[PDB]
Design a protein around this ligand. Sequence first.
Ligand SMILES: */C=C\C(=O)Nc1cccc(CNc2nc(Nc3ccc(N4CCN(C)CC4)cc3OC)ncc2Cl)c1
Length: 273
Amino acid sequence: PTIFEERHLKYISQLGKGNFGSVELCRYDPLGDNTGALVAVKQLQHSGPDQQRDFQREIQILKALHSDFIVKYRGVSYELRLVMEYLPSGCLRDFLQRHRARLDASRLLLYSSQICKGMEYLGSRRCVHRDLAARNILVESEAHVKIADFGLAKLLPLDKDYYVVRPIFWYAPESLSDNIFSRQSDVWSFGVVLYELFTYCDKSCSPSAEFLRMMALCRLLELLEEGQRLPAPPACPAEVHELMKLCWAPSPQDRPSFSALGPQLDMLWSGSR
Ligand SMILES: */C=C\C(=O)Nc1cccc(CNc2nc(Nc3ccc(N4CCN(C)CC4)cc3OC)ncc2Cl)c1
């Protein structure tokens, strides 16, 4: 159903805990026979007027997005709760670190393509994610990934292609300097996600570790303005690194679209065999 009756939601475990609000594993079983489906349930803890309104926004955005690469909205529970599908393989950051020995360049290109397709759909719906990282991508299986956590997601103002809003290593220069967020700033974050994948989210050479080695917020902007970028991950295919470099173009209008990146990654995967 579109409405999930509260009394039928059995708590199992904690899937996440943010500054305000948490996500928990629940078995929605109205029969009481312990045969119900497993769902991820989001609720707000301490919260406030700002957080409650942003959560209300998040629910509506997730409800309207229909992509095989964006976490599925299931319904609501009324003390509002957001009910979503349960991806049992955890987040992509955890997955790569755990399965590094098995995952080859072809599989990383598959994820890259999937995140790109989802990111493209998101853009067509005039939506900006604002927090695109490997920790915010969820794993369905070894061959399927989905974009999650739309808590920071903002819908573009009807008369503009950017939003100014009042984890900085994934943020574009225009974002750090003028707090500007566009579909083009999401492209910059995608380039970092691409780096995260071909490093298998290694802590030693993570975007945080590499940038701190290269140089607190003005110091990072200084580097990006100077042309300083993340190094080409070890054994990373040349063409993938060239796409990362293009996603990291200083001017947002010079960055490729997700519509342009999509086929370029898809044709690279075909080359991997
Ligand atoms: C990368 C850490 C993380 O927890 N990320 C993350 C991103 C987006 C959304 C969520 C929570 N929502 C959610 N979660 C799942 N499944 C899921 C996610 C994360 C974990 N963890 C891995 C191990 N560890 C205990 C920390 C958290 C587990 C699982 O379930 C297996 N499915 C759907 C949704 Cl909406 C979390």
